[PDB]
């Protein structure tokens, strides 16, 4: 059950769901890497910080 | 940076009726430069790990 799924609308109100009916388990997927993967920088005329992700 | 030129002229007729004249001596000027240079480069990043290299 999740709350956030594709729906759209056509006109006088109607409603239509979709639904996906996978069942399967699975696809795949996986991490791999950048270099420099995080990061912190300032700037010192002003008081800041920072973070990166990427 | 200076520097003293040598001396030169004529000896004289030595000679009566008449007396000698000393003589004198010069100077002289010497310059030079400063100068200064420099450059830089750069890359960027996501080029390095998609490449296979750095």
């Given at each position: 059950?999740?709350?956030?799924?594709?729906?759209?609308?056509?006109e006088?109100?109607?409603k239509?769901?979709?639904?996906?009916?996978?069942?399967?388990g699975?696809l795949?997927?996986?991490?791999?890497?950048?270099?420099?993967?995080?990061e912190?920088?300032?700037?010192?005329?002003?008081?800041?910080?920072?973070?990166?992700?990427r | 940076?200076?520097?003293?030129?040598?001396?030169d002229?004529?000896?004289?007729?030595?000679?009566?009726?008449?007396?000698?004249?000393?003589?004198?001596?010069?100077?002289g000027?010497?310059?030079?430069?400063?100068?200064?240079?420099?450059?830089?480069?750069?890359?960027?990043?996501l080029?390095?790990?998609?490449?296979?290299?750095?």
């Open positions: 059950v999740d709350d956030s799924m594709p729906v759209e609308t056509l006088d109100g109607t239509v769901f979709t639904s996906y009916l996978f069942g399967a699975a795949g997927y996986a991490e791999g890497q950048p270099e420099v993967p995080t912190t920088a300032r700037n010192a005329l002003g008081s800041q910080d920072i973070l990166i992700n | 940076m200076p520097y003293w030129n040598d001396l002229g004529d000896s004289q007729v030595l000679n009566d009726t008449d007396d000698l004249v000393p003589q004198k001596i010069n100077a000027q010497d310059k030079a430069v400063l100068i200064l240079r420099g450059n830089a480069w750069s890359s960027h990043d080029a390095a790990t998609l490449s296979g290299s750095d």
